């Protein structure tokens, strides 16, 4: 049978098990969010304004929900070798600046390709994407003089932000090859204080509600 030292080691192991269970429960209660986007897509400012060498973790809380955002923009390596680490993230935040439609990598096409790859990635089949359209003020200020047709030749109609950013959003959503299983949340960013955080909270709540509904058999 177990000796005194063996019994003490077993008790220490059980205490470690209790601590591990507590830490796992704390992790489960808090929400994990993944951040993606180009360097100039505004994700830097988004992280700075949501904060109430390698990867950066941004832990913040809003209305009893603990949110931790992971910035993988500093990883200059192919995603497929490490993207699988974020399979369990409740939602993915993708930041795109609408002002890049006339920039030079046509980096808007690169952002679209990145969004396509992330969305159709086999690891994120059931992971929703929270699309953040940044720098909308600059986009509307510049579109009135520079037409959106530069990036999208198929675009038709008046060149105004109201019917241009919506078209950009539809084009981004057209990349969905699995619309049935996953969902995309789109938001417009301004010089707000907490509206972006409010939208993130609402999106997380909606994702949780949809997951519960699917567990119930609906949706």
């Amino acid at each position: 049978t177990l000796s005194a030292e063996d019994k003490a080691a077993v008790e220490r192991s059980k205490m470690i098990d209790r601590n591990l269970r507590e830490d796992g429960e704390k992790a489960a209660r808090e929400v994990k969010l993944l951040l993606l986007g180009a360097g100039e897509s505004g994700k830097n400012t988004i992280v700075k304004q949501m904060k109430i060498t390698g990867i950066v973790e941004t832990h913040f809380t809003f209305k009893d929900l603990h949110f931790k955002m992971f910035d993988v923009g500093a990883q200059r390596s192919e995603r497929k070798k490490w993207i699988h680490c974020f399979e369990g993230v409740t939602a993915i935040i993708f930041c795109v600046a609408l002002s890049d439609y006339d920039l030079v990598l046509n980096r808007m096409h690169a952002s679209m390709k990145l969004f396509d790859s992330i969305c159709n990635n086999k690891w994120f089949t059931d992971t929703s994407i929270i699309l953040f359209l940044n720098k909308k003020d600059l986009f509307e200020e510049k579109i009135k003089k520079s037409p959106l047709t530069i990036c999208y030749p198929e675009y038709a109609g008046s060149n105004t932000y109201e019917e241009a950013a919506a078209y950009i959003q539809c084009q981004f959503e057209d990349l969905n090859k699995r619309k049935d299983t996953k969902e995309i949340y789109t938001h417009f960013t301004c010089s707000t204080d907490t509206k972006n955080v409010q939208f993130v909270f609402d999106a997380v709540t909606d994702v949780i509600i949809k997951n519960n509904l699917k567990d119930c058999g609906l949706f």
Partner: peptide, 15 residues
């Protein structure tokens, strides 16, 4: 469920 399906929250930007 029907409210969400037919009256989803305004999380879809300009859709």
């Amino acid at each position: 469920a029907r409210n969400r399906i037919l009256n989803p929250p305004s999380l879809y930007g300009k859709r």
